[PDB]
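Usage example:
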Amino acid sequence: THPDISVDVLVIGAGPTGLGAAKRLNQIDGPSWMIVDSNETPGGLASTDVTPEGFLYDVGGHVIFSHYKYFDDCLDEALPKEDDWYTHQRISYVRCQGQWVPYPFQNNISMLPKEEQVKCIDGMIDAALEARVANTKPKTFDEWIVRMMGTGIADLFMRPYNFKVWAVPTTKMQCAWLGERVAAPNLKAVTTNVILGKTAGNWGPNATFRFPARGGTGGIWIAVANTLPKEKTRFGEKGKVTKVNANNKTVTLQDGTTIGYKKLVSTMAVDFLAEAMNDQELVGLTKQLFYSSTHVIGVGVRGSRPERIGDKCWLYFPEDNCPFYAATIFSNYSPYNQPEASKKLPTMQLADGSRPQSTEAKEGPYWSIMLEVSESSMKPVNQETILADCIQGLVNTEMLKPTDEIVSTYHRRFDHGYPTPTLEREGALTQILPKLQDKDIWSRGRFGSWRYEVGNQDHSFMLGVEAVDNIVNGAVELTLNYPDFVNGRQNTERRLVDGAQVFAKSKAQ
Amino acid sequence: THPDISVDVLVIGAGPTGLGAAKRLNQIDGPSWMIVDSNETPGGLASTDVTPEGFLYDVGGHVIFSHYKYFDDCLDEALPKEDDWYTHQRISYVRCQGQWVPYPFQNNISMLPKEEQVKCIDGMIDAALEARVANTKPKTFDEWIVRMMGTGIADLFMRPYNFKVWAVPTTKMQCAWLGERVAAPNLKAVTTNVILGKTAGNWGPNATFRFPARGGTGGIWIAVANTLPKEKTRFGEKGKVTKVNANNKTVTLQDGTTIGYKKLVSTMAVDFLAEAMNDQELVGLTKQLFYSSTHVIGVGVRGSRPERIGDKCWLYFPEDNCPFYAATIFSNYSPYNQPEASKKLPTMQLADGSRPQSTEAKEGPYWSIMLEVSESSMKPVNQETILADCIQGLVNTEMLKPTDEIVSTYHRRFDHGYPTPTLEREGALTQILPKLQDKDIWSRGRFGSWRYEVGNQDHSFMLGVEAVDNIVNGAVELTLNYPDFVNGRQNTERRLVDGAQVFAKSKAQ
Amino acid sequence: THPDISVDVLVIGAGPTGLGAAKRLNQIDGPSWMIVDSNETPGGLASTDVTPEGFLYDVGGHVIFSHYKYFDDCLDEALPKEDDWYTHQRISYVRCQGQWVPYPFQNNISMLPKEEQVKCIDGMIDAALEARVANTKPKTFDEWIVRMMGTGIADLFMRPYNFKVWAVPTTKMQCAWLGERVAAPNLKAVTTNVILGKTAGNWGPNATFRFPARGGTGGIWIAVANTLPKEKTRFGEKGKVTKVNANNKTVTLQDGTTIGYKKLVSTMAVDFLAEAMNDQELVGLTKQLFYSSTHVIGVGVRGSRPERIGDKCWLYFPEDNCPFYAATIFSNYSPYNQPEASKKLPTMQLADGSRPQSTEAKEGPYWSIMLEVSESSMKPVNQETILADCIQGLVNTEMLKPTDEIVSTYHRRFDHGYPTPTLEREGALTQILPKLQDKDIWSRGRFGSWRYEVGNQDHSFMLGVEAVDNIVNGAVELTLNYPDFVNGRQNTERRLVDGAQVFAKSKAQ
Amino acid sequence: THPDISVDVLVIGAGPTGLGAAKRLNQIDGPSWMIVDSNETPGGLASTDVTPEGFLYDVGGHVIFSHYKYFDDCLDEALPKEDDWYTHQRISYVRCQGQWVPYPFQNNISMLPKEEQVKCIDGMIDAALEARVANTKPKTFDEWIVRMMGTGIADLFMRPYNFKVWAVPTTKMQCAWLGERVAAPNLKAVTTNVILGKTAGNWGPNATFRFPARGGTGGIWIAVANTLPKEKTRFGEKGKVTKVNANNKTVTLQDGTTIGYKKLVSTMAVDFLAEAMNDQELVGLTKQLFYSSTHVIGVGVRGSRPERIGDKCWLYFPEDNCPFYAATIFSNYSPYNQPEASKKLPTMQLADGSRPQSTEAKEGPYWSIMLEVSESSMKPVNQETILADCIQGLVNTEMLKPTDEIVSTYHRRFDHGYPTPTLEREGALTQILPKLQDKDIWSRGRFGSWRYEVGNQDHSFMLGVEAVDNIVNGAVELTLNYPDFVNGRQNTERRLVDGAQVFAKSKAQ
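Running the assembly step on the lines above writes:
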């Protein structure tokens, strides 16, 4: 038959990965193509939302660090101005027994109760002598942890937190994925630091980072999308992909529109990929993976930001006094993530969950905090409770005086929050992925790919870019198959203008 | 002034590297490009010779295990017919103590005296213990050897072999360039062998391969080149470059003709290049590294190839029982390497260097042997003595009976035969190579990029290809920059058919 | 009341230990004393028995190696003549898959099937690399074995044999006791030996050893006893100790004789000790110990000793084709352990368990073999079967041709054969022994002490000696509390004549 | 011809050792003997001396730990009175850059400058790892030291100090003398104690030594000496032994007396013994030995035990500002180690060594510092300076304010202070001792038998007892050839009254 229309290449989804695709597609501009999204608003998970009260919230505190000069090119193109951006220094703390413990946890043991210090140092000495003897390799993530850290830190922080974040015990996932993320401590220097009750806060992927002036992180993907030809895109219920026939290389939509493709690029969750294909084998295979749902909770609050807080960017919570694994001061990122002091809002409620004295709308400055709470079969959540539970956690954490006035409340639940790096993961993937490609499909994304090592924004955008560049110029996908490689380097070669483009506009003479 | 000719990208040299340039270049066909070469006949050092007596001798008799599907693509495009190729499993030997020992060396140690067996093993056991206890690595190749090998093993085989082949010790070499080239010995495996007296030859990158029926290894490049647009090529006095004006982007010839270039790809020897553009910073740099000059000697011999010779291909010579560092049975490769069975040739003279009984021209069939030996300031050779001593060595090594009739002989020598991986090499190259791109020069190859880790035909051709792909599409050269990457993988993505090509075709409608 | 008689010191039992006691007691001569034994014939387990056919058998092949110059003194005194003794070289073999494998097993792997050789060498390489990493210590005997030897030899020989001997799995006993007994292999030299198919038979406690001219090893203790005052001794049913009251320091006998003592020395089995004391606590404690019963089997056989046998002294049987753990050629030791060739005996039966072809008494020379079979709750035995089962095992071991004529048969069962070095042993002893001493009692012996490390004849005799010397001169008991000490040395200080004795006879002037 | 008298045993020298040997000679009371010394006084070099002002000083901080219940027996007997006993908890410090640091110095590193802290700590880390791996053995004292400490603590105590006290580079001394303990730096302890800045030292509740109420350790000597019948002693210029003929077993006395002996115990310096016996070989051999020459200097001071002094016992000095390796406050051991408060004495000099402005003789109370200065040809000393040195450096360490008043001075240089544990010491000893012993000579002593491992008063004493009881009771000399053994145990077995003796006494009935 005749597909309603046909291109050489079809990109499904408007998130960062889909947009990497669209960006290189558009840049080379050799082949027929176009991109679709169920969302009239592009950016997917990387997008932003807002409360009627006027407070903005990302999906869980998205911050920028990139290994890609291409990614950076695209960004600077979409937000070219100096003031389109704010530049911040990473500030991280961990809440343990009343303390704010500077990240990395390790050398900051100095700030601990001396007894817990003792425990940590002990377990760590054990791990050190033991490691001295190793040819071999860690099996589980847990095992890895215990190996690089020691049972003191393991029991104290690592385990409880990492379950709080992953919604599964650290024993049940693997250690393959940790290369530039998770910190492995050096005993000698830790001893030293503790001796001196001093800190080293310089390490981490985040030394400096930047944030969009206004519009939250969703503004990046809006601005980025704006750069494309519009008739080459469809977002809305017209963008919703209902069905896939990989044998006809055709896709059916919500409106029953049909589309042909020579090749396909899909950023949508691979399980839904399969479900939409009606491929029994494939779905059976995709069920083998695991993921965690995220609940995002922001809070509007009245009054100029407290002194107890200040320059703190985001931070973590191992203890069980709070439902959330992490939290973020959004106000610190820019002035535009919350309304203006000048504007008058009424107090929604007291931090202790009580009526304010009255109903009047007053102004003051304000501030914003965004915390995230995980859910899975091993760690469920109750929706109604969970919000109040969070606010409570804030109380308990010495975050808010119960006297504090809550001006705003935000809650939303995301079904696929995280690819879960379980042990079964590589077994399932190494099956799924190549299976797809032989059908001429590139599944890439936080979910399309399902590799969390690679699940950051630049990572995704570059998964799209690479998938494309492979489909055209036969480029290998390093972001995909060689994460430690891509992460362990600055990638300078690929730019938004390539010698091809240069020599074409050269040819124009 | 304007120059006589101008290209987007200028390619110098017919070396497989350069031809990789011209091939990818032509394929994409985006910018203007050409190739210019001194030699009238393509392939350069990959090109083949024949004695006045009708025997073919390559330069070394190069054989193939290929890491490049694109490569095999151009090869199967140049040789689309069935009979075009012959295929063989590898037979490799090592000459010590009146005994032929197969590769890999150590397992087959069972063919040695139980005494030499003993000592070797002991070196290997000590080495094994130390091996379990080191966390660290070798500065030098020698330390490398002794480390994963042991002494008896080393002295018997490794150190001497590498002297004969490099014209240098094992101590003056850096240890970083291998792990493809040589096996990882399991003292266990070696033992189980020695225990049983069992024979298995499995190891090496030489595993199985193809050889051109006719033309030797040079016909390949003849063909592959004849697939290029002719106006895009110059080989002869019309092709020789007398000078390079580096910042004028201009190139000057032996007939006087001139070329400006947007990009410059040199496969030409990096030192040669240095003096050529006449810059003493660069020439000082280049001269910071020296090389081993190589001697190639082929020889034709009368009658059915002997009882002893049989299925063997190439052989290693650690012992001082001769001059030559290694040899090849060239006739083994193809039936067409030697003159026809029916052709009559007289015996030029006996393997014992005396005169023959019959100055008569008779036939038998003929077999051909071809061996190579290096030379340098620290391992000199005599130009007049060499040949004689080679044939002598043939007799000794039990290649020959002095009764044997020499039908033909070949000798020729190349000044730059091998890049030598000095401990000083990268420290220098990290200066030499980078600067060229500041001038827009990709100097790639064996002697172009000076890395034998990627030294071989398919590799060099690849340095060219990738230099192209980087110059157009901004790919990174993992061949040049990252050897173990490309080597430890099969690279399936890059090819003679890519999306660009395909959709040029499709859209043509 | 009045004990029938009273001495200062009472020794119970005439075995080697008891005799050590009596010997030093007598030597010093200071205190009142005497010694009693249930046995009209002294020597206990160290004694000898004889078949009506005239073949004598020890209790399981007792051979002499001593660390004690005092022991040696006593011996030379009792058997002062040159010809009272024979001097032999230790010859030991192990039956594995048809081979006679020279002791020590390890380096004699050369004589093994090359495949089993492989296995052994492998397990051993493992154990070696693993041991290279150890600070730590072996827990069980099994663990010890596997550590020093490797899983090849472990599975092959050590495990099955050691259960065959101990009547308990190696896992269930401790590695504390092995210092000069059990051999721990050196990989390097083992490899070497195997490469050369050669042997090293020089190690062991036994390099040379001696045997009593006539009378078996019982003759030693007969002579040794003869050396004492007779009225100072009681052996018979007049020597049998029925009861002990440690509170009265009095002992009652079979005849109801009663005896007082200031101190007591007891070589009798400590469990029977406690049972005889009627001490509930004690017995409860002594039940915590384990031991193995021994069945001793000798064989009279007709005809001059076979060539297959020769100089072989004794040897071991890991395999399950035979009931017995060990066997000895008694004929080799002395000509007097079997009757004289000149004497005519009838054939009792065929080696295949049949009737001879006549009942007539014929002479020939003869020969003797003494094998031992263990018993315990984990390895029981059937009395009647077990003999014929043994003869059978001989047939199967290529010991006797079924055609061989059996002249003589010996069988006897010993309830306490061995102290079993179970893991529980030290826990039990450290409770039992000091408990005893506070009652002024020294329990010493193979069974009085229950320490097998110390369970050899010289060990025993010296346990008696030391216990005494302690009870008088405040000597420490090194044989007892410091076995590794006594064993790792030649003990030259203590003699049969001491300075005291010399200076007393000096005082006689 | 004839000796003026004949003994079985001749003991040369009245010091601790001679006294031990004698003590058992009588203990046993089997044979005849005589004991001699050239001094009217028993006690040799373990003694005490008294000043004109009535101060007194032991010979170097003689302290109580006995591994021997026998040694104790002798004591308790000698000095019956509890009111003759003074009991002191063990107290110890070291002077480090102004600091008093509780033994062990390791665990108290906490009191130190932080730079030096981490220094020591990296030292111990590196050490604890390399040691983690060690298959090998330390060939020097120093070697083993660093293997214990890590270079940090290594530098900061034992190198400069142990050279201070040993007067030889510790790299020139064996570590073997410290016997069987593995040099396994204990990191967890140091680390933790360092975290806590927690001070932890010497030992208490328990660590203690008793001291004679009056008359010092010479006082002890006379105390237990008097317990002998007088006739068997020769003491004075009279007892002095001027010649040794081991052939006739005659010792020629000073007065012209000569004495025959069956066996000989001689505690005078091994060398000097070789001189007296005029043995050339043994002279040339004793030439091989080494040892240090010692200076003892005590000080009278005015006033009551000071602030910085406290109840502290004795302390060490690694630094170069003071000549002594150690000093003990005698004041605390017995109130009688100094004149009575009411005694009236003049003041010699001022702590800084100025004139007492008043030369009147007044009372006040007093206290006492003894200290010790090392000498070798490696570390020569100056008699003149030395007193004033220990003075100054005493102020350099702030043991005095320059005003502190000195009531008296004691100085003496003891020729043979210490035998040194050089590597060569066993090369000498092991040869020399068998030589002598076979002459029927037991040469035991500080410099008689030469081993610091067992150098204590109790070690000497019991080495003599050991020897004698060898000759008579057939006893091995454990404190002799097994200092690891004797030093590692509770030796309860030999008492001053032995069962033998108790039985002899019962037969006195």
